[PDB]
Amino acid sequence: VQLVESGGGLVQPGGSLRLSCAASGFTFSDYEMHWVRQAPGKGLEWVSGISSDGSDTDYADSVKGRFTISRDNSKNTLYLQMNSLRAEDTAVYYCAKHQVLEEAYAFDLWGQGTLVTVSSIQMTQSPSSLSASVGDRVTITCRASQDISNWLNWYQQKPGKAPKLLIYAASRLQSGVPSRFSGSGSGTDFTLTISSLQPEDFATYYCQQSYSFPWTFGQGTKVEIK
Amino acid sequence: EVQLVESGGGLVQPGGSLRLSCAASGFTFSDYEMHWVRQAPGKGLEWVSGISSDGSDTDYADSVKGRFTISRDNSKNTLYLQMNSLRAEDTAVYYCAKHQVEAYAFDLWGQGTLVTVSSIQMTQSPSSLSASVGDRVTITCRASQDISNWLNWYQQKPGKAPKLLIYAASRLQSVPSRFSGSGSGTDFTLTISSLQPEDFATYYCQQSYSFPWTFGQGTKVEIK
Structure with a gap:
């Protein structure tokens, strides 16, 4: 597929x-x-x-x-x-x-x-970038310009790679993503949490509201090394 | 040929x-x-x-x-x-x-x-080291899982084709006696008993246990 x-x-x-x-x-x-x-x-x-x-x-x-x-x-x-x-x-x-999905x-x-x-609905994520080490707990926040209930997804985009669906409906883990990833929140403030950062988790993360059209994404949160 | x-x-x-x-x-x-x-x-x-x-x-x-x-x-x-x-x-x-x-x-x-x-992970240690001719060189590889003896070692000089040295953790390819491999399960070591001048190279381990095949980051053996 x-x-x-x-x-x-x-x-x-x-x-x-x-x-x-x-x-x-x-x-x-x-x-x-x-x-x-x-x-x-x-x-x-x-x-x-x-x-x-x-x-x-x-x-x-x-x-x-x-x-x-x-x-x-x-x-x-x-x-x-x-x-x-x-x-x-x-x-x-x-x-x-x-x-x-459900x-x-x-x-x-x-x-x-x-x-x-x-050549010749607004989504705000925080932080915009952060530097961490392996083993660290990482907390990423998304705030919505309106109530959107649990109509919120999270994507992971590794450097030079296609984005990937991590969580849908604010808290539901997609098949195959490991337990260390977890989402919470409803209404207007949402959290993606990586309980213990692994080296393959260094990536950019995006939230996306699925409540009203057009679909809008957060600006992204870059998880850098060092 | x-x-x-x-x-x-x-x-x-x-x-x-x-x-x-x-x-x-x-x-x-x-x-x-x-x-x-x-x-x-x-x-x-x-x-x-x-x-x-x-x-x-x-x-x-x-x-x-x-x-x-x-x-x-x-x-x-x-x-x-x-x-x-x-x-x-x-x-x-x-x-x-x-x-x-x-x-x-x-x-x-x-x-x-x-x-x-302009996913089995392998970790090698050290990443680079300086040695002299005659030295004993010990290179270490750790697997993120038990892989029994399903582990090979390669040698790569600058600009030359990489070369298979040891397979199945300890078995030498048709490669001098000074090269020696050991370990099983999750910890492996590559050993050069007496460094030769043509032995200065970059070495890589590779697990042959589960697909996709994965390598260590390499060990560069430099002069000094």
């Missing part, structure tokens, strides 16, 4: 690119699919989404009228037509599957991302 | 692509599982990708799934690695290696090709 993005590259301002996202191991046609991007000044930014049958589409305001999302459910392929590209569109672009919605499958370079 | 030769490296901006090739000669390439293994200054050795003998089954490390594609042309005795959407973290020397079986080890490597872009 994986998603594989292709089509990135270097493009002049005002240029065009077409990204494709090839899905495998699951019934692609059954799932809402989305593009999410991260610019060199990071933080995840939802770009666009499309319903399972391809009839309903959505875009972030910053890409309206320039990007077009589509899908070929017969070839398990998602597309993003990017016209009139701008310097600010420089980013890694992720393809992601939206899943109803009674909640999360992006539970992501691709590794493709790089686009152009 | 048994050898592997990698080509296709170079310098690339982030997000670019390269295609590495590994040319095999002197053995029946089509019969063997083939692998790519890479080395950055920080990580030691890191297994990247493997492909079954017939080219139909492939495997990738988590750090490169979906960006790298391994394939083989068994009619031209050639392994390939297509690297798309390259990252700074992919900067490494890339080796192609043949997997060999009693025990499982990487018994043949190429000299490597350099790419610049």
Whole structure:
């Protein structure tokens, strides 16, 4: 089971690119699919989404009228037509599957991302970065600009790696993530806690509200070494 | 005239692509599982990708799934690695290696090709050490799990193909008597009884017990 993005590259301002996202191991046609991007000044930014049958589409305001999302459910392929590209569109672009997990919605499958370079409800996380050692207890906080009940997910993004779903619905651990990771909170203040930091836990962590559209992420919390 | 030769490296901006090739000669390439293994200054050795003998089954490390594609042309005795959407973290020397079986080890490597872009854990100690000719050198490896004697040691000189020294914790490859391996379970030690001048090199341990195959960060043996 994986998603594989292709089509990135270097493009002049005002240029065009077409990204494709090839899905495998699951019934692609059954799932809402989305593009999410991260610019060199990071933080995840939802770009666009499309319903399972391809009839309903959505875009972030910053890409309206320039990007077009589509899908070929017969070839398990998602597309993003990017016209009139701008310097600010420089980013890694992720393809992601939206899943109803228990009674909640999360992006539970992501691709590794493709790089686009152009040249010739608010979520607040704290801290923005922290340095720690192996064995340390790490506390990361997310505050929501509104009550969102337990409609909150946490993602882990290792350096140079695709983001990964850690916790959904504020406290529910995703399959495979170890017990040291734990989430708590409801309403407007949420906590991700790593009970004992391991070397593979050095990463950037993102919260994301799943309560009202458009989906918004926190700016990220960088967990650095030393 | 048994050898592997990698080509296709170079310098690339982030997000670019390269295609590495590994040319095999002197053995029946089509019969063997083939692998790519890479080395950055920080990580030691890191297994990247493997492909079954017939080219139909492939495997990738988590750090490169979906960006790298391994394939083989068994009619031209050639392994390939297509690297798309390259990252700074992919900067490494890339080796192609043949997997060999009693025990499982990487018994043949190429000299490597350099790419610049601009879960059982093994811990080795020391990371570097200075010694003289005639010295006894003791290198230690610890596994995050019991792995009985499923543990190999490699030697790597600058710019030369890595070399299999000891497999199954204590068994010498067809390698001088001064080299000696011991340990089982979770603690292993590599011993050079009397350092020779051609013995100044970087050494790596590797567990052959559970997939994915993992290496220690390496022990650099320097002069002084």
